[PDB]
Structures are given as structure tokens and as C-alpha cells.
Amino acid sequence: TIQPGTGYNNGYFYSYWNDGHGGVTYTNGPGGQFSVNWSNSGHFVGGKGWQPGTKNKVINFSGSYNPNGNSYLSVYGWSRNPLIEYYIVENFGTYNPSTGATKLGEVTSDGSVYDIYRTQRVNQPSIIGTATFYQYWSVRRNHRSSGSVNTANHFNAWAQQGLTLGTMDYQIVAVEGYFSSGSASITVS
């Protein structure tokens, strides 16, 4: 496993964060590859991509994703000004992260309809410190662990619906887990 933090590996930005509970390892592999193995973890997020992201990136991902419990596989990132945490969720485990959330539309992209949602985090950690901020979600109806994500289709649909993004910060393909178990091996480009 690697030390939690951010950096570059084989031409890709990476971020690996966890809450210190234990039970998760993250490794960077060749090119855009990373692996995550977890067993009765706490909360963590790890993956590879870009710093900064862009608003018209086509992101390719390939591999295996085998959660047992609460986890997501997403294009994940942030903007600043406004501060937004966003997800284009391609697959998940026992919990659909939009459960109970306000639906803000639909968008069709890359072979599936996605449902769009907005949620709010109140006084929570963020890339700029503790803050209250919105999260934007596109949740894929047809789950998969490989594919291509045309981010513009999402960002444009979000904007159409009044979900504005600021200046991009990082943008990765991430495996997130919340007190669960699993394995994943994903290659980004």
C-alpha cells in the first residue's frame, strides 16, 4: 500500500485518502492503473486521473470492481468558486448514493441514461477546509466497470439544470468505500 496523500505516478495524478480506521490498501500500478483491496474498512477514496481536470475530458476506465457493501466507482472531482464535489457514478455496491436525494433531471451518455441529483454537505471537510457545499451526481442506470465517460455531457446537463461548476480542481476515476469490503483494479486514460 502507499501512504495516503496525493502525487503523480506514471503520468497520472493520484489521490488516496482514508479516515484512519484501517482495513484498506491502495496501490499505484503501471500507466493509469491502480488497485484497492479492503476488508471492514472505514471511509476511503482513491484513484488516478488529472490535476486539474477539464470540462471536456473523455475519460476511459477499464477493469474489475467487486464491492461487498457500501462503495462507489465514479469519475470524481471538485471545482472551486463555487466549491462543488461531483460524481459520475458508473457502479456501486449496496447503497445508491442518490437515495433520498432531489432528482434534477436525466442525461443520456455513453450507452446509458443517468439520473441527476443535487445534495448538500453541511460543515464537512473539503479541498478548502470545513465548509458547506453542494454535491452534483449523475448516477448510471446500467452499471459497469469499464467504459468511456464524456464528461462534457454531464457538466453541460448539470449546467442546463442550474448546477454550476467553478474552476476545476482534481478529476479522477475513484473507488470510494464506506465501512465495507471489496477489491478493485482499474486502469484510467
Q: Residue 158 phi/psi, 5° resolution? A: -60, -50
Q: What is the CATH number of domain 1-189?
A: 2.60.120.180
Annotated binding site for substrate: 72, 76, 87, 121, 125, 135, 170
Using the CB atoms, write b or e for 71-97: b if 16+ within 10 Å: bbbbbbbbbeeebbbbbbbbbbbeeeb
Q: Which of 142, 138, 140, 173 minimizes the C-alpha distance to 158?
A: 138
Separation CA 105–CA 116 (nearest Å) = 5
Grid cell at residue 69:
457493501
Experimental determination technique: X-ray
Give the span between the Cα atoms of 16 and 68, in whole angstroms: 20
Catalytic residues: 85, 176
Exposure string for 57-66, b = 16+ CB within 10 A, e = fewer: bebebbbebe
The annotation places the binding site at: 72, 76, 87, 121, 125, 135, 170
- Residue 172 grid coordinates: 479522477
CA 123 to chain CA mean position, Å: 20
Please name every residue paired with 58 in a beta bridge, in sequence order, or none if there are none. 150
Distance of CA 128 to the CA centre of its chain: 18
Distances from the Cα of 155 to the Cαs of 60, 73, 79, 109, in angstroms?
17, 18, 11, 11
Q: Among 187, 92, 90, 178, which Cα is nearest to 138's?
A: 90
